[PDB]
Amino acid sequence: VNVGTVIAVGDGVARLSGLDQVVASEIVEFPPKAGRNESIYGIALNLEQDSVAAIILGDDETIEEGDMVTSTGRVISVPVGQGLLGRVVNPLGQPIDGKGPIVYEKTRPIERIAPGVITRKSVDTPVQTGIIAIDALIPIGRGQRELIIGDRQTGKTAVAIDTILNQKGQGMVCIYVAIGQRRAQVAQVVGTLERFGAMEYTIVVSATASESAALQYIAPYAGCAMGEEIMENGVMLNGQLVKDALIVYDDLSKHAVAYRQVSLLLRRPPGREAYPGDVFYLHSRLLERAARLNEEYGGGSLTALPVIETQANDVSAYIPTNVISITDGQIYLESDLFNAGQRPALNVGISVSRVGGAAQTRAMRAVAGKLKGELAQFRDLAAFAQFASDLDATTKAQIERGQRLQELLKQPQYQPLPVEDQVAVLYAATNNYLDDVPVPLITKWRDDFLAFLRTAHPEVRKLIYDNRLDRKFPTPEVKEALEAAIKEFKATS
Amino acid sequence: RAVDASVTSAIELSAEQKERITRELQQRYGDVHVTYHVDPTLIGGLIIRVGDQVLDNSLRARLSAIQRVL
Amino acid sequence: AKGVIQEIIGVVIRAKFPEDEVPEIYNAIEIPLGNGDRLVCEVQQQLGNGVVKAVAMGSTDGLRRGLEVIDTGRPIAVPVGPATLGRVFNVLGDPIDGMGPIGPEVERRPIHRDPPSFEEQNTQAQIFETGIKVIDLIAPFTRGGKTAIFGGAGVGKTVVIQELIANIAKEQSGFSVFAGVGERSREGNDLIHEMKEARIDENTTVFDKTVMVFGQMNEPPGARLRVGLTALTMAEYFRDEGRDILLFIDNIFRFVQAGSEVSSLLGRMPSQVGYQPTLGTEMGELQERITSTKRGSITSMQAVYVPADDYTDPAPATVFSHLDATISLERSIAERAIFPAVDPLASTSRILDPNIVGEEHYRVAQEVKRVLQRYKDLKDIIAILGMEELSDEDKLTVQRARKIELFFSQPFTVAQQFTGRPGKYVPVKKTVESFARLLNGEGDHIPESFFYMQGDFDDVLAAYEASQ
Amino acid sequence: AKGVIQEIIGVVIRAKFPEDEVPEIYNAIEIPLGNGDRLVCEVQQQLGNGVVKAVAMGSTDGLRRGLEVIDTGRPIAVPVGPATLGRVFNVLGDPIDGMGPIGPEVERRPIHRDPPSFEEQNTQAQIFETGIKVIDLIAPFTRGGKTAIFGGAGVGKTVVIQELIANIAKEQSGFSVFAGVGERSREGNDLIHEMKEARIDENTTVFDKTVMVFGQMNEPPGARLRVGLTALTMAEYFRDEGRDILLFIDNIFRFVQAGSEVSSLLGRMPSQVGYQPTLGTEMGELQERITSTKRGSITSMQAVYVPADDYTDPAPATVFSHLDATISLERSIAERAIFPAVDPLASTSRILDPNIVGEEHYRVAQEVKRVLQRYKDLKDIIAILGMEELSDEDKLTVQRARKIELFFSQPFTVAQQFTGRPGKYVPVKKTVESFARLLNGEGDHIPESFFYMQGDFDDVLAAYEA
Amino acid sequence: AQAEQERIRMLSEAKSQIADLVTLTASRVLGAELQARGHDALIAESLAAL
Amino acid sequence: AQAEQERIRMLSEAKSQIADLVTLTASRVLGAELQARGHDALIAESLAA
Numbered sequence A: 001v002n003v004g005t006v007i008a009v010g011d012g013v014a015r016l017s018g019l020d021q022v023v024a025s026e027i028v029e030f031p032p033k034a035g036r037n038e039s040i041y042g043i044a045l046n047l048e049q050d051s052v053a054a055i056i057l058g059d060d061e062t063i064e065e066g067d068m069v070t071s072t073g074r075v076i077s078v079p080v081g082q083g084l085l086g087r088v089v090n091p092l093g094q095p096i097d098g099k100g101p102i103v104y105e106k107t108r109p110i111e112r113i114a115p116g117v118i119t120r121k122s123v124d125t126p127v128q129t130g131i132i133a134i135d136a137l138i139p140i141g142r143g144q145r146e147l148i149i150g151d152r153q154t155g156k157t158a159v160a161i162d163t164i165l166n167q168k169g170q171g172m173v174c175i176y177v178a179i180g181q182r183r184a185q186v187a188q189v190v191g192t193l194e195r196f197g198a199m200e201y202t203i204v205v206s207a208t209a210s211e212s213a214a215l216q217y218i219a220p221y222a223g224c225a226m227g228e229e230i231m232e233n234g235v236m237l238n239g240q241l242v243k244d245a246l247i248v249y250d251d252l253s254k255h256a257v258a259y260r261q262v263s264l265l266l267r268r269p270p271g272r273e274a275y276p277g278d279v280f281y282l283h284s285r286l287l288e289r290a291a292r293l294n295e296e297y298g299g300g301s302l303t304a305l306p307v308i309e310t311q312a313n314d315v316s317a318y319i320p321t322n323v324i325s326i327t328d329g330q331i332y333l334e335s336d337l338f339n340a341g342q343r344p345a346l347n348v349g350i351s352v353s354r355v356g357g358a359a360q361t362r363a364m365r366a367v368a369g370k371l372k373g374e375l376a377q378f379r380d381l382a383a384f385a386q387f388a389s390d391l392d393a394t395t396k397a398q399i400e401r402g403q404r405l406q407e408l409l410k411q412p413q414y415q416p417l418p419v420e421d422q423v424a425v426l427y428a429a430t431n432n433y434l435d436d437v438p439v440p441l442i443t444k445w446r447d448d449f450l451a452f453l454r455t456a457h458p459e460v461r462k463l464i465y466d467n468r469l470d471r472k473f474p475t476p477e478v479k480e481a482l483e484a485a486i487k488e489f490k491a492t493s
Numbered sequence B: 001r002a003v004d005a006s007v008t009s010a011i012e013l014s015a016e017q018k019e020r021i022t023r024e025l026q027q028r029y030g031d032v033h034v035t036y037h038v039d040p041t042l043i044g045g046l047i048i049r050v051g052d053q054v055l056d057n058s059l060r061a062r063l064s065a066i067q068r069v070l
Numbered sequence C: 001a002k003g004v005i006q007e008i009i010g011v012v013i014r015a016k017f018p019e020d021e022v023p024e025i026y027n028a029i030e031i032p033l034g035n036g037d038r039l040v041c042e043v044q045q046q047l048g049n050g051v052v053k054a055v056a057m058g059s060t061d062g063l064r065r066g067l068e069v070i071d072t073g074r075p076i077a078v079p080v081g082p083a084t085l086g087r088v089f090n091v092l093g094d095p096i097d098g099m100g101p102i103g104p105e106v107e108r109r110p111i112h113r114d115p116p117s118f119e120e121q122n123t124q125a126q127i128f129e130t131g132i133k134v135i136d137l138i139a140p141f142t143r144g145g146k147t148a149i150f151g152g153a154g155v156g157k158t159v160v161i162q163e164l165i166a167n168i169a170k171e172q173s174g175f176s177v178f179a180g181v182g183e184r185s186r187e188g189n190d191l192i193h194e195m196k197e198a199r200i201d202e203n204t205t206v207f208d209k210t211v212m213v214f215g216q217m218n219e220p221p222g223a224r225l226r227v228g229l230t231a232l233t234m235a236e237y238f239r240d241e242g243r244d245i246l247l248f249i250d251n252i253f254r255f256v257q258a259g260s261e262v263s264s265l266l267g268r269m270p271s272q273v274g275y276q277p278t279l280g281t282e283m284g285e286l287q288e289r290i291t292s293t294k295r296g297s298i299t300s301m302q303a304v305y306v307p308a309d310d311y312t313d314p315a316p317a318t319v320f321s322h323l324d325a326t327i328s329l330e331r332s333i334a335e336r337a338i339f340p341a342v343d344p345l346a347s348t349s350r351i352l353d354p355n356i357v358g359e360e361h362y363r364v365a366q367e368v369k370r371v372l373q374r375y376k377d378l379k380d381i382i383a384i385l386g387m388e389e390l391s392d393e394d395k396l397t398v399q400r401a402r403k404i405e406l407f408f409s410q411p412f413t414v415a416q417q418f419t420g421r422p423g424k425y426v427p428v429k430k431t432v433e434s435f436a437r438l439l440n441g442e443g444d445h446i447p448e449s450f451f452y453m454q455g456d457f458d459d460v461l462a463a464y465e466a467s468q
Numbered sequence D: 001a002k003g004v005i006q007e008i009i010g011v012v013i014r015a016k017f018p019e020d021e022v023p024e025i026y027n028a029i030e031i032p033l034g035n036g037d038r039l040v041c042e043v044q045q046q047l048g049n050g051v052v053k054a055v056a057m058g059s060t061d062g063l064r065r066g067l068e069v070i071d072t073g074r075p076i077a078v079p080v081g082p083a084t085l086g087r088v089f090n091v092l093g094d095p096i097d098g099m100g101p102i103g104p105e106v107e108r109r110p111i112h113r114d115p116p117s118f119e120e121q122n123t124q125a126q127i128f129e130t131g132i133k134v135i136d137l138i139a140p141f142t143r144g145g146k147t148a149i150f151g152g153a154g155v156g157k158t159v160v161i162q163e164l165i166a167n168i169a170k171e172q173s174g175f176s177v178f179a180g181v182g183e184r185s186r187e188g189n190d191l192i193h194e195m196k197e198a199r200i201d202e203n204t205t206v207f208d209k210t211v212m213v214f215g216q217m218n219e220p221p222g223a224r225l226r227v228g229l230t231a232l233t234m235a236e237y238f239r240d241e242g243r244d245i246l247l248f249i250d251n252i253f254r255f256v257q258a259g260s261e262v263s264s265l266l267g268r269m270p271s272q273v274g275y276q277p278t279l280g281t282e283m284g285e286l287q288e289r290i291t292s293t294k295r296g297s298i299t300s301m302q303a304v305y306v307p308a309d310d311y312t313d314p315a316p317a318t319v320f321s322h323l324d325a326t327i328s329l330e331r332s333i334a335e336r337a338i339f340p341a342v343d344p345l346a347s348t349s350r351i352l353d354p355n356i357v358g359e360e361h362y363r364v365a366q367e368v369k370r371v372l373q374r375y376k377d378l379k380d381i382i383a384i385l386g387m388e389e390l391s392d393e394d395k396l397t398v399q400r401a402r403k404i405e406l407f408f409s410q411p412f413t414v415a416q417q418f419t420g421r422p423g424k425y426v427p428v429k430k431t432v433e434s435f436a437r438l439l440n441g442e443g444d445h446i447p448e449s450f451f452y453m454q455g456d457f458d459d460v461l462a463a464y465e466a
Numbered sequence E: 001a002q003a004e005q006e007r008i009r010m011l012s013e014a015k016s017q018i019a020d021l022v023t024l025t026a027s028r029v030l031g032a033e034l035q036a037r038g039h040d041a042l043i044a045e046s047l048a049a050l
Numbered sequence F: 001a002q003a004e005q006e007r008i009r010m011l012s013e014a015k016s017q018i019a020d021l022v023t024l025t026a027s028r029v030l031g032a033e034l035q036a037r038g039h040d041a042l043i044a045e046s047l048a049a
Ligand SMILES: Nc1ncnc2c1ncn2[C@@H]1O[C@H](COP(=O)(O)OP(=O)(O)OP(=O)(O)O)[C@@H](O)[C@H]1O
Pocket: A150, A151, A152, A153, A154, A155, A156, A157, A158, A159, A185, A343, A344, A411, A412, A413, D350, D351, D352, D353
C-alpha cells in the first residue's frame, strides 16, 4: 500500500497510479534505479481517485513511466535542529556545500498552520540591523515582519546581509533563504557570510534559478520550519539557548513566479497577472508563522525579512501589494536615491514600521525622534531647494542640516554599526555639533569618531550600552561624558 | 486471488521452491497469482510485491552502504 | 452517516455516502482524524450516487483516502447568547482563549441562516459621530447602516479601524462583535485584544462587551470563508433581542478570496480574474445578513482590500453596492504622508443629506467637494505649466484645495507607536465649523504646512500664533 | 526502442513505444526519412501507456502516422572538441557549412547538461579584461558573468563582437562561441561568415578561433529553443579544459519567443503577456551554465531585443534578472564616426563597485559619468542659447566631456584593414590612469582632435607633440 | 591555491571511484558467498518480516 | 603524480579492498558472518581491485 507506479510524467507533475493510504501532502520517494543513484522526492497533492498527482521536487527528466514510487509515511518535512547551523542545504534539507551529511534528531513538517492569535505578544525586543537609517527610522523588533521592497539592483540583498552580519552577539539564529537567485549570487552571499564569520549562526537554504519549480516553492517553507524550530525549541548559540531567530526570504517575487509556474503547469485557472488565485494565501501562510510568542508559549520569536523586487518602481503591482498587506512594515529602496550616491537608498517619506516603534531601545528612539522630524522638514524644504539666495536663514540652515543628516545616513556596505556607536553618532548630529563639518567629509568624520571611540574611549561606549535601556537616556553622566568626548575629538581634528 | 503478486528473488529457484513461495503466503489469500523474475542484481533476499505491498530484503543493504560512505 | 473519502483535492474533500443517507447541501461532516480531535468539513455540492464535495476548513494535509467521515446531520452550529460575550471563537464556534469551553446549555445556532426579509428592513439611520474630520465631514459614519473603507496595501486601513474602535467602542450603549475574516494575527488581533482590555467602562472593560471571531490569514480557505457567517450568527442573536450592536468585519476581500480559492478547488468555471462564478450570490448571502431590522440595529463597519490598487476588481465592485457610506483610501494620498488617506471625491455617504446631518454640514461638505473637484480638474494644468497660468479665483480655489487636503489629516491615538504626535478627537460640529471658516477665507494667510496633522481650526490658529 | 508515430499535429508529434523502454524527457527520438537524412524530435512529455509528446524540430511535412521512430536514449548529441572550431552547426550538431561531416571519432555530449554545482562557483567576482577602453571603463565585464548589448545592428555591434573574440584569442586562451538564436539566413549568416573570414588577427582569422551555431529563423520553434543549449554544450567542453570562453547569443529574446511558441504548441497555459508559464525555469536552465567555475569560466555577451521597448515586459525582465553588465549601443553616437558607439550613461555594470574593481576605477568611472551627465543636461542650453551664455567652470566641463567622448574611440585590431589603423589593446589599469589624468587637467590645451581613434593618454600626448 | 584545488578535486574523484569499485567488489563477493551458502536460507527471514 | 601514487597503493587487494569488502559484508549482509559457509574463495582473491 506504500508503493505505486508512475503512469505519466509531464509538466513537472507525475501521476503515481495506485498509491493509496498516502496522506494529502506526503513526500513520495521515487527509489533509485539504473542510471539514477540518488532518490528524488515528490509531493503528492491531488489525491484524486485511482491517481495521485505528485510534484517532482527536482528535474522531471530523471523519472519515466513505470518507475516505482514508495510513500515515506511522512507529510513533507525538512530536517531541522542544531546540525543545520552553519550549513547550506537544499529546500528538502539535503546539503549542497559538500561539507558532509546533515545531522539531525527530529524533523519539523513544513506547511503547518501558524501558532494563532492568543499565542502571541506585542514585540518589545529590538533587532539591530546595523544600518543607521533603518535602525533610527524603521525600527525592527524580534518577531516583526519587515518587508524589504526595491527595484532590482538597489541593495535589498545587501541590507539583508548587513542585518544578518550584525546579529553576531545578539543571540539570533539568522536564516537566509535564496529563492530563484542565480547560483553565482548565492555563492557570493555564502562567501561573504563566511568571510565575516557570521556563517557560524546562519542557515542558508538555496533554491536557485536552474532548480525545478517544485523547489523555489517549498524553500521558504523549509526556512520557515527551521525558524519555527528555533523559535519553539531553540538551539545552543555561544553556550546559551536562543529562541529568537531571523529569516530572510530574499526574492519572494521569484517565489510567486515559481508558484505561478507550478499552478499553470497543473492547469489551475489563472488570476490577476496570471498568478493563481491563492498566491496571497501562499505568502500569508508563509509569513504568518513568523511570530513573537508570549511567555507562556515559550517567549520565542521569529523575525521575517521578505524581499520583493518591483519593476520600474511600481509598488502598486499584485505581489508587492500582497506582501505589503501581509507584513508589518516596508523598507522602500528607491532606485533614484541609489543612483544618486545614497547607497543605503531609503524612501524615508513612505517607508514605515507600524509595529516596532515601541520595540526600540529608549536611547535610539529618544535621539531619533527629532532626527525623523528634521528629515521631514528637509523633505518639505526639498521644493524650495531650487531657489538661490531667496531663502531666509532658517530655511537655509534646515536644508544644510538635512543634507548633513542624509550624508550621515549614507553608510558603506559590509560595515554594521553597534547600537552605542549609532546612538552616539545621532546624538552628535542632532545637537548642532556637526553644523561646522562640511557635507562631503561627514562620512569620514563618522568613521574617525567611531575609531576614536573604539580606541580612546571604550568606557563611554560601555556606559552608553549599559544605559541604553533607561527611560530617560540623556542622563547627566552620559550626556557630559559624550559631550566631552565629542569636544575632545573636535579639538583634535 | 483478488490481488496478484510479483515476488522476485536473488537467483532462479526450483519448481518446489516456487510452491514454497506460493504456500508461505497464507496471510493474505493463501495462494495469489504470482510472477517470478531473477534479475541477478538481487543478492541474498526476496522482493515480494503482494497486493500493493512491497518488502525489500535484497540489495538494499549494499545500496544503503553507498549513502553511508558517500 | 459513516461515509468514506474518495478524493482529497486541496482543501476540498469528496466523500461517498450511502445512497439513502447523503448529507444535505450545507451539512457539517467530520473526519475523526485520530488523536481524539476531528476535522469539521462543510458540504458544498452533491455530485451523484452519494458523493458530496465538502470544504475541509482545516489543515487537510495529513489525511489519506478511504478515511471515514461522520455526517452530523446539521450545518455548522455556533454558541450564541451572553455566554459568547468577552470570548474569542473559531469559525467552528470553538473558543480559543484560555477560558473553558461553552457549556451545552448555551443555544447553538446554524451559521447558515436566511437574511431578514423585505418586511423586516429598517431604513431609519442617523449620523454616528466618530471624531475623524474626513470621515465625519465627507462620508459620515452611518448609525444602523453598513459602511466600509476601501484601501490598498500601504494605506492605513487597520489604523483607521483601530482608531474608530477606540473612539466609539467606549460609548457603545450595547454589545459589539469583531470578525477579522482575513487579517494579520499581529495587528488585526492580539493587539486589538490589548487595546480593548485596556479600555475600561465603569469597571467593565470594552472587551467584556465584545464577541471576537477571527479565522486569521494563517487559516485555510474554509475558515476564512465561513468566519464571517459565524460572526454574523453570533451578532444576530443580540440584534434580534434589541441590543444595539457594533459590527467590525475586517477585510471582506479576504472572504471573497477564500471563496475564490475554494471555488477553484471545487472545479467551478472561473469568472473574470479567476474569481468564483458565484461571487455576487455569496456577497449577497453574507452582506444581506448585516442589516439593522425592526427588532434591533447593527452599526456595521467593514474593511475592503483592493488587489494591487485596482478599484475595478470584482470584489470591491461587488462590495460597493452593499454599503450606505463608502470611504476610499488612495495610495497617492498616503504617499503624501496624509495618514487618513481618504479621497473625498471618491468617498460618499447616503446620510449626507441636509434633513439628516444638518443644513450647514451638507453645505460645507458639498463645498469641500466642489473644491478639490476644481483641483482634480486643474491637476494637469498645474503639473505641466504651474500655478501662474490659472485665473485669480482659480488660484485661490487651488490653494484652498491644497489647504483642505492637508487639513483632512488628523493624528490618531493609535498612531503613537510610530508617530510622536498626540491623537486628536475632533467633534463633527468642530469639523464643520473649521471647514466653514476655512472656506470663508479665514486661514488664507496661513501657509499650507500649518494644516498638516492638526485638530480643529483653533489648533491651526494657535500653531500659527506660536510660530508668529 | 523502435516506436511508431501515433499523431502528427504541426510540429508536435506523439510516438507510441512499448510499455517499457519509454523515452525519458528530452530524449531526442529520431525518425528515419526514407534516406540517409533523418528527423530528430525532442521528447517533452510522457502521456499514458508509452505515448510521448515531442517537438518535431524539422519539416514534419512528409511524415505519416505509423512510421518507425528510433529512440536515441539520451538528449540531443552535439559534437564537441577542437573539430568544432571554424565550423558552422545547426541545433542538431550537423554542420551546415560546406565542409564534410564531423565524424564518429569526435566526442558527443548531451545537449541538456547541468549547471555547475554550488561548491564549484567562484566566491569572488573577477573583472574580465576585454581591452576596449569604454567597455572596460564605464560598463566593465565580469568573468563568468552575463552581459547584454542593445543596438539596431547598424551600429557596428558585429565589429565589437569581432574585437572581443580577437582580444580573447590573442591575450587569453581565446575560444569563442556564437549562438545564432533565430538568426536570419541571409543578413545574419553569410554576412557574419564573410566578416569573420575576412577579419584576421596574427595570421589567424576570427572565424578559425570561434564556433558558430545557427538556429535559423526558418527552423521550427524547438530548434530555436535548443540552439542556445547546443552552443553551451559546445562551449562547456572548452570550459572544462580551463580555457576562458566568450559565448555570444544573438537576440536572446528570440530564444524566449521560441520557448513561448513551444509552450503554446504543447498546450500549456499562457503566463503574463502570453509567455510560457516556465519562463523563469527556462531562462534558468540557460544562463546558469554561464558561470565562472574553479576549472574555467564562460563569459557571455548576449544581444537583447526589448519587445516594443517594454523593459518591464517579463521577457526582458527575466533576462535582466540574470545580467551583470549592460552595453547600450546608440545610433546617434554611431552617426559620428565613432565605431565603439557605446552610450556611457545608459551602460552600467554590477561589478563597477569599489570592493572589486578598486577605489580608483570606481572614482574615475563616477567622475566620467558625472561630467557626461552634465554635458547631456547642457545639450539643450547649448542648442538654444549657445556656447557664450554658458558660464565659466562649466565650459571647461563641456569641453572635457566632448574630448572624453571622442576619447572612447579606440582602433580595433579586426578593422585595421578597413580603416588602415593598427588596433590598440588598452589594459583596464592603463585606461583608469589615462582617464584620471585626462580628468585632473592634463591634455586641456589639446583640442578635441588627437583624441579620435587613439589609445592611451600617452599616445594622444605623442600625437599632439608630432 | 590553484594547485591544491585541482589536487583536492582529483583526490575526491579518486575516492569516489575507489569506493564505487570497493562496493562493487563487496557485492560480487556477497552474491557468490550467498549462492554457496544457499539462496534458500534468507527466504524464511524474508517471510518473518511479512 | 602524487595522487596517482596514493591511489595506486590503495588499489592493492590487501591494502583496502579486502578490508573494506569484508567489513561491509560483516555489517550489511549479516553480522560477523562474512565467512559463514564457504566464501573463502572470495577472501582477498575475488576482491582483487
Ligand atoms: N550600502 C552599499 N554601499 C555600496 N554599494 C552597495 C551598497 N548596497 C549595495 N551595494 C551595491 O549594489 C549592487 C547590488 O546590490 P545587491 O547585491 O544587494 O543587490 P539588490 O539590489 O539587493 O538586488 P539583486 O539581487 O537583484 O541584484 C552591488 O554592486 C553592491 O555592491
